[PDB]
Amino acid sequence: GMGSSIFDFEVLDADHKPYNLVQHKGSPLLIYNVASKCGYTKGGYETATTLYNKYKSQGFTVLAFPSNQFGGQEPGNEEEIKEFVCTKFKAEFPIMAKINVNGENAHPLYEYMKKTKPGILATKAIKWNFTSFLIDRDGVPVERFSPGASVKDIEEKLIPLLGSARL
């Protein structure tokens, strides 16, 4: 099959310049398909902000991929960042140049992510705000958290990987 880790897939910084994803090789990284918007988040913002900075120290990242609602299928909404004034999210993370994180295009990396682990349901393909994926030391997504889970809720899956319990 295709994809051993998320690192099989080129990432793109907030201007679609190829981002160095594999710099999170060694310590888990949480990549979030985040719905940009303005003023409206769902816990995941303070979650991601604090998680990233508390754990980038080890190697952890919160990669923010601020879904391009311009597509229509996007997990955050659709018309929201088109009718309202919304910057491409942006924060204290490696926030990337927004990708179609959703069931239409996602992105090879997220296609890899939901193909590795679909949704909180039996199956799902991204349909919320931030929606994290707990990517492991070697870039293997083993979780995905909903925008509604906080620092704590993520750490409890993250820390075992940061701290490297292995088994």
Side-chain angles (χ1 to χ4, degrees):
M2 295 295 296
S4 307
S5 311
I6 59 150
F7 301 126
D8 282 272
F9 297 116
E10 190 73 276
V11 176
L12 314 172
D13 183 78
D15 283 316
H16 275 142
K17 317 156 300 188
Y19 178 49
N20 181 211
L21 175 63
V22 260
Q23 67 179 269
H24 310 294
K25 283 204 315 283
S27 303
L29 48 165
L30 264 278
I31 325 186
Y32 302 41
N33 45 91
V34 304
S36 43
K37 274 93 95 63
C38 173
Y40 174 79
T41 186
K42 201 158 175 170
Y45 206 162
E46 63 79 40
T47 295
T49 300
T50 312
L51 276 173
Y52 179 32
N53 276 261
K54 177 157 68 172
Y55 295 124
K56 45 185 283 163
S57 319
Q58 292 178 88
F60 183 46
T61 201
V62 166
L63 297 171
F65 281 75
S67 71
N68 40 262
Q69 304 191 334
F70 306 100
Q73 58 302 277
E74 293 305 74
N77 190 29
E78 46 187 270
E79 301 296 301
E80 199 159 45
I81 59 164
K82 297 189 299 173
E83 62 177 274
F84 302 115
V85 50
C86 321
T87 39
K88 56 175 62 171
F89 174 68
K90 185 173 296 298
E92 304 306 290
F93 327 117
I95 310 85
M96 317 278 76
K98 74 187 56 171
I99 64 183
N100 196 147
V101 275
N102 209 86
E104 204 165 280
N105 170 267
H107 164 288
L109 172 74
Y110 280 79
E111 296 188 86
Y112 169 84
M113 234 150 285
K114 29 156 294 294
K115 78 93 164 179
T116 301
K117 208 175 186 299
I120 306 81
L121 211 61
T123 27
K124 198 64 175 178
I126 302 176
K127 222 299 177 298
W128 289 255
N129 287 27
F130 265 50
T131 313
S132 334
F133 287 88
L134 155 70
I135 308 302
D136 108 292
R137 310 188 312 154
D138 304 91
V140 182
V142 290
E143 303 285 20
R144 126 200 44 55
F145 299 87
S146 308
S150 185
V151 181
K152 155 209 165 300
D153 304 298
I154 289 177
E155 293 178 288
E156 47 185 72
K157 300 299 183 184
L158 162 72
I159 301 176
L161 289 177
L162 294 178
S164 188
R166 288 274 67 246
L167 291 75

